[PDB]
Design a binder for these strands. Structure first.
Ligand code: NA
Ligand code: NA
Length: 330
DNA sequence: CCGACAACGCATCAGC
DNA sequence: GCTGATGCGC
DNA sequence: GTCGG
């Protein structure tokens, strides 16, 4: 893709604003608008020379075009400079970097004097369990995960899941399944045949898997766990003397077999590929989401979901050719 | 002008 | 105690 | 903030 140099100043700029609307203003939608604007500009193989020029790209509007002109004519953005110096905003911004601390908690902390990691360390019992772990692994969580490690992590997850029960089936999705050379977290999708839409969700299916992983000491902390979704912390074992790997984020989801592959495709993305998958499913005459695919009658009314026992199955339906996960980037 | 913008499982907080 | 709202994960 | 019914 284009070199950051090209419009990195613009992209960094728009990203900064994005984190601001997200952490300080609590405007998730504006956050995404800036994020989106930033992406489409990041893939633009041209050094932008005017706000008007950017505006031609989808996702960029009047406001941002104006902001792009100012940045090109002055080298900065006034609203942005006054934000960086605002000790309140910059404090709230920093604190959200801790997993578990959202815009609300971050606002509350800042208000009562808590503004730095140190302050967080001093006020333990003012943090919930999730937040304490985020603090405990602040550094680690901001590190990316190299592919070779996902592999190692994957080797362990499979071995253990299989060591628990042969019938299980687990699939590490996310960008990784598509060959990404680095991941931000592992997202394991799991399922057992003894579980369908109308089947005993056996409160030990997911449990016994988390159970095993805890035994082999791969999973080091739990952020949340229920009957269908687990969010915790994991870590690859080090070798004698050798430095230990950083703790990583992992999520394990239990999906009913009749929805498994349907979800496998979903949480495998990308998102842009999932939409070209969305719109197409429409024309052909099918409704797609993470759980099922349903036939659409002549008046929107979707009939009962169709059987699926593989990603291809879903592909054959919309009469599309199975597009390998490596080429689903779009 | 004005609503959608992805979504929902879980932990915790508010209220009865 | 229970039901519903809200905060959070990106 | 941007898109679009
Ligand atoms: Na535009
Ligand atoms: Na956070």
């Amino acid at each position: 893709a284009p070199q950051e140099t090209l419009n990195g100043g613009i992209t960094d700029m728009l990203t900064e604003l994005a984190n601001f609307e997200k952490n300080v203003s609590q405007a998730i939608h504006k956050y995404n608008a800036y994020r989106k604007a930033a992406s489409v500009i990041a893939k633009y193989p041209h050094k932008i020379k005017s706000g008007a020029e950017a505006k031609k790209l989808p996702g960029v509007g009047t406001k941002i075009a104006e902001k792009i002109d100012e940045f090109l004519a002055t080298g900065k953005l006034r609203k942005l400079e006054k934000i960086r110096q605002d000790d309140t905003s910059s404090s709230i911004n920093f604190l959200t970097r801790v997993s578990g601390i959202g815009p609300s908690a971050a606002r509350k902390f800042v208000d009562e004097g808590i503004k730095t990691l140190e302050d967080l360390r001093k006020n333990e019992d003012k943090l919930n369990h999730h937040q304490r772990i985020g603090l405990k692994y602040f550094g680690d969580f901001e590190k990316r995960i190299p592919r070779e490690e996902m592999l190692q992590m994957q080797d362990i997850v499979l071995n253990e899941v299989k060591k628990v029960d042969s019938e299980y089936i687990a699939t590490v999705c996310g960008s990784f399944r598509r060959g990404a050379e680095s991941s931000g977290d592992m997202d394991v999708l799991l399922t057992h045949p003894s579980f369908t839409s109308e089947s005993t969700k056996q409160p030990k299916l997911l449990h016994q898997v988390v159970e095993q992983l805890q035994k082999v000491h791969f999973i080091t902390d739990t952020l949340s766990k229920g009957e269908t979704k687990f969010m915790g912390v994991c870590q690859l074992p080090s070798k004698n003397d050798e430095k230990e790997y950083p703790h990583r984020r992992i999520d394990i989801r239990l999906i009913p077999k009749d929805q498994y592959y349907c979800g496998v495709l979903y949480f495998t993305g990308s998102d842009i590929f999932n939409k070209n998958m969305r719109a197409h499913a429409l024309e052909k005459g099918f409704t797609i989401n993470e759980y099922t695919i349903r036939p659409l009658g002549v008046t929107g009314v979707a009939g009962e979901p169709l059987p699926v026992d593989s990603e291809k199955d879903i592909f054959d339906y919309i009469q599309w050719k199975y597009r390998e996960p490596k080429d689903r980037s779009e």
